[PDB]
Structure 1
Amino acid sequence: HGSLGFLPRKRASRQRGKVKAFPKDDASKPVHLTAFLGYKAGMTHIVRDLDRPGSKMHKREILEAVTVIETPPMVVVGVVGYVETPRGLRSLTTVWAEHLSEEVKRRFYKNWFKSKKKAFTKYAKKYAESTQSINRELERIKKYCSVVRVLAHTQIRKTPLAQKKAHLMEIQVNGGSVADKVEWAREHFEKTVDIKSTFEQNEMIDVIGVTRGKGNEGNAGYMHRTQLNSKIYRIGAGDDAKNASTDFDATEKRITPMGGFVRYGVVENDFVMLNGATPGPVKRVLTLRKSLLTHTSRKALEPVSLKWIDTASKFGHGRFQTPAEAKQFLGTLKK
């Protein structure tokens, strides 16, 4: 058999990979976030210069397989205050935003269509009527609670996914005093937080998610897993047309490979490219978290400058990055 630290080998009790540990809080650092939620689209292979001192491929180039995760900006819909107790952390109270998008309202219902859409109705009414209760609760969190987690949901509509329920979750707000975290959450109420503001493509992060099920084996598969030290290679912007165009390559193109991502679609929003494989198949939600413990060796610290990113047809033996140059080489078709 395998390692005894992973048994009992049973199905994960959650579709979305839940964070089990957040980086330790620091008052010296100002107020920011630590985790983000994305959707796996697939991976390609890229050619990257190797600036690895002491290595035998120093000042050379290697080919690396890199997973692409679409990460549309996340909407902060609430905040949760946690108070330390002799029996552990306890959720003291929760404050939600006044207006919640249908994407996050669909989470509370198994049948949103048959529902009367009554979620947060009186909550929105009391929010508009009197703000003294909201002020009392926020003052309660900043005075008593020691850990602050913002409720954020993903804009699943932008992703080419048939699912319309947003994966609501909590992001621990590490940095500054408790009042600073509360002020940060209130300012960011109803707004959007971007992965460009959270991660910046040169740090060492961990990816967590549920693996894909292999059926029945002599149970094997569909288990919660935590990959450590997955390096971000590029946080590409969806709007920019140079997202998949490096400086050594030009050739204006998009990260979505020609022919589309297999069983996922076309990536149009901000995407994240991580070195190596990540758990879960395509179209499954993955969670990203910062480094709990600081460890930047040369591999985790060296800068990265991509040279060429493959966008060939992953469906089948693709042999052309873009239909433009495909038509330039291939003879003119009958159509």
Structure 2
Amino acid sequence: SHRKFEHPRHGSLGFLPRKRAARHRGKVKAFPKDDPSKPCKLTAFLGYKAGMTHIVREVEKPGSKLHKKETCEAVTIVETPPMVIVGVVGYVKTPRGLRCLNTVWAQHLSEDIKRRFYKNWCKSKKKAFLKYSKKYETDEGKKDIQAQLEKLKKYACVIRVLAHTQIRKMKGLKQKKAHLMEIQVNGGSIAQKVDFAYGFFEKQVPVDAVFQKDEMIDIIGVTKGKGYEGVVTRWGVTRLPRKTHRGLRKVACIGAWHPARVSFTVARAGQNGYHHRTEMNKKVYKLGKVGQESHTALTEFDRTEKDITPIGGFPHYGVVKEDYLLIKGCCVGTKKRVVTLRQSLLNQTSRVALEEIKLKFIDTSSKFGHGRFQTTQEKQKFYGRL
């Protein structure tokens, strides 16, 4: 018989299976559509989640209750030191999808990236790319390298650069093995893309070259892990009455008599968290460039001299010293987790997307408690230098 009363089902069937992701680094499932008329430009960037804080800004939203008023909104700090281009890869459009044609690497590869090719770097002989690097040392070898590049210019339809992070510059991560990914190049002709990619071999690409302030971006990563979990927490099914024999944190009926099988739409206990997710429309409130006033937490209204890092350091992360992005809202994953930043696939035309951000105050009090001092000097002056 029909169910007595109607309510929507618990959970989404579009995020199945709820298994552990087969990767730790966020994978870009789709890159922005390529517009040849635009200059060559990267479409993605890697970063590390440092922590969260809140900011205050004066809203400019005509017709809104908040117009010319102040609002406090949470932000996430993503430390984004420049990436290093170490190779280029070209794909050919075939009836069976894109097929990788060839991969060309730079002559010199850092130790941090070479660690990515080993399970035990210290115990190994460190032979990776040693023979490959030698053909850059001979005229005949150089001709072969150039020939491979010309082959990409002739047949490749999609060009992606091999870029890795400088993870050594963030000592808080306690990791020396850098993260490598393919970043697609959009704009210009195929020849320009290859020339654009080859020109950056062994060079650094700052985050500012990919993203900017006030634009919407997509954040990709793996959510926080939580292990084996029951249906109530995993799927959000309501608890059973107090007097239920054999427990109340369950789904009462997991299926009708027919079909004589448990369906895949029924909530079941299992892995919760550590799932791959792609979240859209995260606005960039601030881009901090090292060596510039933008790197500090100063604002046109608050002239207190202070850094982005709260006193005592970002919990479980450390001190942010490299380029960083201030992103509205929350970011997937734990502290220190590598996150993938991607340009929006949609055309940003809403007023929120085009809104010009103007921060008034950035909170730098300690996040390891009920912090009430924005700077260490303020705290010391409070206690008579303590």
Secondary structure in 2 aligned to 1:139? helix
Secondary structure in 1 aligned to 2:168? coil
Residue identity in the other structure for 2:379: A
Contact 1:43/1:66 (<8 A) preserved: yes
Judge which range, 315-324 or 148-157, deviates more.
Answer: 315-324
Distance 1:194 1:19 in 2: 19
Distance 2:168 2:217 in 1: 26
Secondary structure in 2 aligned to 1:137? helix
Q: Which runs of 5+ in 2 are unaligned?
A: 1-9, 231-270
Aligned-pair CA distance for 1:126:
0.8
Count of matched residue pairs? 333
Aligned-pair CA distance for 1:121:
0.4
Distance 2:114 2:334 in 1: 26
Distance 1:256 1:294 in 2: 34
Contact 2:348/2:354 (<8 A) preserved: no
Residue identity in the other structure for 1:211: T
Q: Which runs of 5+ in 1 are unaligned?
A: none
Matching of residue 42 in structure 1 with residue 26 in structure 2: no
Matching of residue 248 in structure 1 with residue 301 in structure 2: yes
Matching of residue 153 in structure 1 with residue 153 in structure 2: no
Aligned match of 2:102: 93
- What are the within-5 Å matches in structure 2 for residues 1-335 of structure 1? 1-129=10-138, 130-160=141-171, 161-218=173-230, 219-240=271-292, 243-333=296-386
Distance 1:4 1:268 in 2: 42
Identity %: 66
Residue identity in the other structure for 2:273: G
Secondary structure in 2 aligned to 1:157? helix
Distance 2:64 2:83 in 1: 39
Secondary structure in 1 aligned to 2:272? coil
Aligned-pair CA distance for 1:238:
2.7
Deviations 1:37-88, CA, capped at 9 Å, x for gaps: 0000111000011011221111111001000000010000000001101000
Residue identity in the other structure for 2:123: K
Distance 1:248 1:170 in 2: 41
Secondary structure in 2 aligned to 1:79? strand
Distance 1:7 1:186 in 2: 40
Contact 1:81/1:147 (<8 A) preserved: yes
- The structure with the larger Rg is 2
Secondary structure in 2 aligned to 1:216? strand
Deviations 1:114-135, CA, capped at 9 Å, x for gaps: 1111011011101221211111
Distance 2:291 2:114 in 1: 27
Secondary structure in 2 aligned to 1:205? strand
Aligned-pair CA distance for 1:214:
1.2
The ranges of structure 1 where at least 4 consecutive aligned residues each deviate by more than 3 angstroms after the TM superposition are none
Judge which range, 71-80 or 318-327, deviates more.
Answer: 318-327
Secondary structure in 2 aligned to 1:131? helix
Distance 1:109 1:283 in 2: 22
Aligned-pair CA distance for 1:241:
5.3
Secondary structure in 2 aligned to 1:117? coil
Contact 2:219/2:331 (<8 A) preserved: yes
Contact 2:308/2:320 (<8 A) preserved: yes
Distance 1:74 1:106 in 2: 16
TM (norm. structure 2) is: 0.85
Superposed CA RMSD:
1.0
Judge which range, 320-329 or 145-154, deviates more.
Answer: 320-329
TM (norm. structure 1) is: 0.98
Distance 1:17 1:186 in 2: 25
Contact 1:209/1:280 (<8 A) preserved: yes
Distance 2:339 2:50 in 1: 10
Residue identity in the other structure for 2:20: R
